[PDB]
Write a protein that binds this ligand. Structure first.
Ligand SMILES: [Zn+2]
Lengths: 191, 172, 147, 289, 73, 286
């Protein structure tokens, strides 16, 4: 019911292609977004979710839309053939978020971190600092091979909203056989 | 108080459009829109950006940017008009304001009304106030009461339209 | 009309009538009555340069009510007649290239015209600054300011 | 009783006129229509900034043609780009018919007026407005209940007869009887004229190109031959100098002929062409090595 | 109205009696010329009507029935 | 390849409007939009355009947003209004290209493969031609140099279809110059040409200075083309041409002389006719 626009950032880098998760990472993201996108619209029928690919560039494949069909359909042919750039991904997701057609929805972002992020620790925190000022809650969930609970990533979520913040979770998924059930249990119903 | 022939735009404020940035969870935006002691505070810094949206194009005469006398009341207010997209803090300082206002202590009092240049605000559809400091230089600023006084501009709502005279299926 | 009519009788010589006119202009429907009011007050204190009258005339002008402007502008000019008031000329023009309501300019065109009455060299800048402005109404005000 | 003072103007931006003329010629055989976006800045001025075409439909130019879904969505999308204007009126072409409103048009205008008492309606004949002239009269229904009072209910003003006089090809289709015209004035401003001046602007290269001498010599030879024959008449016309009321001779032989009009008129052409050509020739000799 | 303004007893002359520029009179015409843009401004020509008169005031308030003559040839 | 991109007057008058719409409140750099138009043999006709919400950041020069749905939906409406327009490229009024142009151009390549970006310098009003048209080419640079995206240049020219032409001609109607030219305007056409040729030659000099001082890369191509222009000079000092120039200069002076004489005899005849006129009326008055 909480009016919020979920700008889901789905990874499509090359490492996203090795299936430490049973069938493949992508289906995990592709299955995962299926629930997060569906989770938000079910919670509130006035909601809207868009997706930003994060590898090799920051494409905006589907702008912020309520209809979940477009997000699901666009997921296909996501073609994981790039290198993740999370430094810019959040900005473009937020900058696109700033174009919210309705100005009332709260802000909530879901990032699909599935590759090793090569970002200076100082840069990530400064990005987090800009998010704090502008009151956007972003959830980070990690997939596939990556320095488990990257220190750069973990510092990001903590400064994301601390001092008794909303708790934009850095939900770390158990690598190995696991569906979005971990991604749906904790983050999807509570972010 | 209010001037002759002008009415507060509280009824005209679009709850959907309005959104604050840096608003603290405990004291939110809705608090400063009520004529109560309930107020709004900025969580992450003294800078705050409180935007509002009006149902139909309104005109602006005098806003009452009241603030607590503890020193956390607003000090420097930058107003923008009809912003196509929400504003960014970094880009908000850069851009030139429609009317750069230096609040004085007399204004922040409960009875203080700050006059705006009526000429510049003639077709405002959404106004964004940017509090750049509080009087006491406190960690968080506060807006006790904040609303706009003007007149409503009659807007042609084409959504209604609807034929009023004539018969359907008639050509030139 | 009557309030404007009253000014004509006490034209150039209001004396006491100005104080009544000031009070009456303030209490008005913010319509035609304000239009006649400013013209009457401006006519009554024509050249008085009185600050009290000038401040009220400005507020009506800043009201920006179109019909109100066309009279407040002239009333603004007449009260400042031949005063070369640097604030008035800067203020009067500043409204010109900042306001819609062509009508308000039409008063301001003559309104800033009379503010330079008879200096004959003293400004010669409004004459040149105005004549270059793109807004045709201000140009006319520049040409009148030559007159 | 409010009144549309004749001084009231419908300001048409430089954008709108090109876009309104473009739409009209787009479907010139048929009739096109669209809503105009503007502001009612005050009683005496109806300012129109942008116009957006409402898609041609079989109904024609009528209330039904106004697709509420198309207009509600288009407005919504133009609000994001930075044009939060209000629907200030509607326009429709009139393939050569003129600048008048038919019965069906009147019913439309009455509808638009229902939402705001100042919704101006324009025309825009793309066939007549074919040269420097632009035939686009604005119109606002004069409510029929004001027959007791004065039609065109204007007041103190004096720009009623200016910028136009009641056009006959329209006064017959109902003017000052059910629809009155509103003075149309275009809000062209600098930074818009300058960009339009580029339409036919030449370039740096032009003005230094020396023409071509083969057709220049032919042209110089051609005109000098033609002027020669015109001198023969000049000799005959002057050497005649017949004095049988010469002032009447100078008025019974006026047909744009020998004496001067076909005379130095050519001298100006002949001398302008050579001087410019020569000056171009010498400038190039200096600039280019 | 202009021809018979004031009952044939006033005249418009921006120049003052002693060669000065009559500020009330000159202002009157300028704002009057701005009647093309506003009819109610028309009355401002009232300022330009200076009674073409000579009063035989001898004392402060005395208004003697002075009998004086002109030169209509 | 596109030989020309003829920009119609309406587009540069909507872009100007588009720049004013935003810059008036949201002070920002280039305003990006979509450019519609009909194709031709090779000359792309730009007949209309519309704005697309575009926000950018000076940091990382790749945190931007060009809305997709707004671009898709807008064109969904316009193809309804007029069906001869297809999306053909984009426009931005920032006079100098950005680092974001290549990436965004790749996007507009998703709607029209032969996408041409037209830079409209809305703010400047100068020598002329406020449109600069660019394409996207990815070549191996034949001459053994790294590959990259780059924007190739396409000749731009501003024209007008009949309908807009009528509107434009009236729209000026106060500063248009006489088409005849006359001696006054023809000469000004040359002081104008001289000013340009100097101005173009001065842009060339600064760049040559830049390559001379190293601050810029020796193109190795187009660099010697400027050497081509440097050999195409006339060499007027040649005797055989020097004779042939005096002949044509002399060939023309004898026509301006005959033109001058005719205008003089007509002048005297007009004074004699006039001297008779006032004199005859002078005597006839008595
Ligand atoms: Zn019709």
């Amino acid at each position: 019911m909480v009016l919020e626009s979920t700008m889901v950032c789905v990874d499509n880098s090359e490492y996203m292609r090795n299936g430490d998760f049973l069938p493949t990472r992508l289906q995990a993201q592709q299955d995962a977004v299926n629930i997060v996108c569906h989770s938000k619209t079910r919670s509130n029928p006035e909601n809207n979710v868009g997706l930003i690919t994060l590898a090799n560039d920051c494409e905006v494949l589907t702008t912020l839309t309520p209809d979940t069909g477009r997000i699901l359909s666009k997921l296909h042919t996501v073609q994981p053939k790039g290198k993740i750039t999370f430094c810019t991904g959040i900005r473009v997701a937020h900058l696109a978020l700033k174009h919210r057609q309705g100005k009332n929805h709260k802000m909530r972002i879901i990032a699909f971190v599935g590759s090793p992020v090569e970002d200076n620790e100082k840069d990530l925190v400064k990005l987090a600092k800009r998010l704090k000022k502008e009151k956007v809650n972003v959830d980070i969930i990690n997939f596939g091979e990556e320095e488990v609970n990257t220190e750069k990533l973990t510092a990001f979520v903590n400064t994301l909203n601390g001092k008794d913040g909303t708790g934009s979770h850095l939900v770390t998924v158990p690598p190995g056989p696991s569906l979005a059930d971990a991604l749906i249990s904790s983050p999807i119903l509570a972010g | 108080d209010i001037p002759k022939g002008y009415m507060d735009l509280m009824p005209f404020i679009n709850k959907a459009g309005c959104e604050c940035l840096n608003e603290s969870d405990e004291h939110g935006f809705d608090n400063c829109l009520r004529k109560d002691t309930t107020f709004l505070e900025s969580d992450c810094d003294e800078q705050l950006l409180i935007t509002v949206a009006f149902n139909q194009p309104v005109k602006l005469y005098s806003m009452k940017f009241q603030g607590p006398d503890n020193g956390q009341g607003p000090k420097y207010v930058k107003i923008f008009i009809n912003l196509p997209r929400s504003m960014d803090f970094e880009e908000a300082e850069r851009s030139e304001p429609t009317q750069a206002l230096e609040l004085t202590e007399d204004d922040i009092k409960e009875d203080g009304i700050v006059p705006l240049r009526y000429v510049k605000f003639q077709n405002v559809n959404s106004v964004t106030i940017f509090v750049q400091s509080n009087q006491g230089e406190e960690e968080t600023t506060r807006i006790s009461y904040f609303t706009f006084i003007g007149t409503p501009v009659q807007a042609t709502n084409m959504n209604d339209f609807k034929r009023v005279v004539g018969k359907k299926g008639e050509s030139h | 009309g009557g309030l404007y009519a009253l000014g004509l009788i006490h034209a150039n010589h209001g004396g006491d009538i100005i104080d009544y006119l000031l009070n009456q202009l303030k209490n008005a429907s913010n319509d035609i009555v304000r239009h006649g009011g400013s013209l009457g007050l401006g006519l009554a204190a024509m050249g008085t340069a009185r600050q009290d009258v000038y401040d009220l005339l400005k507020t009506n002008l800043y009201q920006d009510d179109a019909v109100t402007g066309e009279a407040a502008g002239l009333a603004l000019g007449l009260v400042m007649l031949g005063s070369k008031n640097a604030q008035a000329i800067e203020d009067m023009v500043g409204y010109a290239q900042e306001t819609q309501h062509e009508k308000i300019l039409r008063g301001l065109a003559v309104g800033i015209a009379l503010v330079m009455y008879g200096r004959m060299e003293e400004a010669d800048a409004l004459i040149e600054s105005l004549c270059r402005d793109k807004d045709p109404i201000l140009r006319r005000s520049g040409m009148y300011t030559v007159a | 009783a409010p009144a549309v003072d004749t001084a009231e103007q419908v300001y048409i931006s430089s954008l709108a006129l090109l876009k309104m003329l473009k739409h009209g010629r787009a479907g010139v055989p048929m009739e096109v229509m669209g809503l105009m976006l503007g502001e009612f800045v005050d009683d005496y001025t109806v300012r129109v900034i942008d116009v957006f075409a409402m898609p041609q439909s079989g109904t024609g130019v009528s209330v039904e043609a106004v697709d509420p879904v198309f207009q509600a969505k288009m407005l919504d999308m133009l609000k994001q780009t930075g044009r939060p204007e209000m629907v200030v009126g509607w326009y429709h072409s009139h393939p050569g018919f003129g600048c008048w409103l038919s019965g069906v048009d009147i019913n439309t205008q009455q509808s638009f007026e229902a939402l705001s008492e100042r919704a101006v309606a324009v025309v825009v004949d793309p066939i007549q407005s074919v040269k420097g002239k632009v035939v686009i009269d604005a119109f606002r229904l004069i409510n029929a209940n004001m027959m007791v009072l004065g039609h065109e209910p204007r007041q103190t003003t004096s720009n009623l007869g200016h910028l136009n006089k009641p056009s006959i090809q329209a006064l017959i289709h109902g003017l000052n009887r059910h629809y009155y015209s509103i003075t149309i004035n275009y809000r062209k401003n600098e930074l818009e004229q300058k960009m339009l001046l580029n339409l036919h602007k030449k370039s740096w290269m032009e003005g230094l190109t020396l023409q071509d001498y083969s057709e220049h010599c032919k042209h110089n030879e051609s005109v000098v031959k033609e002027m020669l024959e015109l001198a023969k008449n000049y000799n005959k016309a002057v050497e005649e100098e017949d004095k049988m009321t010469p002032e009447q001779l100078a008025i019974k032989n006026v047909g744009k002929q020998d004496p001067k009009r076909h005379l130095e008129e050519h001298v100006d052409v002949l001398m302008t062409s050579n001087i410019v050509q020569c000056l171009a020739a010498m400038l190039d000799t200096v600039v280019f090595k | 109205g202009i021809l018979d303004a004031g009952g044939h007893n006033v005249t418009i002359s921006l120049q003052s009696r002693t060669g000065h520029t009559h500020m009330p009179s000159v202002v009157g015409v300028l704002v009057f010329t701005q009647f093309w843009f506003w009819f109610p401004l028309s009355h401002f020509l009232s300022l330009a009507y200076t009674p073409t008169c000579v009063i035989g005031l001898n004392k402060d308030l005395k208004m003697p029935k002075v009998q004086y003559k002109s030169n209509c040839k | 390849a596109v030989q020309k991109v003829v920009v119609h007057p309406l587009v540069l008058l909507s872009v100007v409007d588009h720049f004013n719409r935003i810059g008036k409140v949201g002070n920002q750099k280039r305003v990006v939009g979509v450019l519609l138009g009909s194709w031709q043999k090779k000359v792309l006709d730009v007949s209309n355009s519309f704005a697309v919400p575009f926000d950018e950041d000076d940091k990382d020069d790749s945190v931007w947003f060009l809305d997709h749905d707004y671009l898709e939906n807008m064109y969904g409406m316009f193809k309804k209004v007029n069906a001869r327009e297809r999306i053909v490229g984009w426009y931005h009024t920032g006079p100098k290209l950005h680092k974001n142009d290549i990436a965004i151009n790749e996007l507009m390549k998703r709607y029209c493969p032969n996408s041409v970006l037209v830079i409209i310098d809305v703010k400047p009003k100068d020598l002329g031609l406020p449109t600069e048209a660019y394409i996207s080419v990815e070549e191996v640079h034949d001459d053994g140099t790294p590959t990259s995206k780059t924007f190739e240049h396409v000749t731009s020219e501003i024209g007008a279809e009949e309908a807009e032409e009528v509107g434009v001609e009236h729209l000026l109607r106060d500063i248009k110059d006489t088409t005849v030219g006359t001696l006054s305007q023809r000469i000004t056409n040359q002081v104008h040409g001289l000013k340009g040729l100097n101005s173009k030659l001065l842009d060339i000099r600064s760049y040559l200075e830049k390559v001379a001082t190293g601050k810029l890369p020796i193109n190795h191509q187009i660099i010697y083309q400027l050497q081509d222009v440097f050999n195409l000079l006339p060499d007027v000092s040649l005797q055989e041409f020097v004779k042939a120039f005096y002949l044509k200069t002399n060939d023309q002076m004898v026509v301006v002389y005959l033109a001058s004489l005719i205008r003089s005899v007509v002048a005297l005849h007009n004074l004699i006719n006039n001297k008779i006129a006032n004199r005859d009326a002078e005597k006839k008055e008595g």
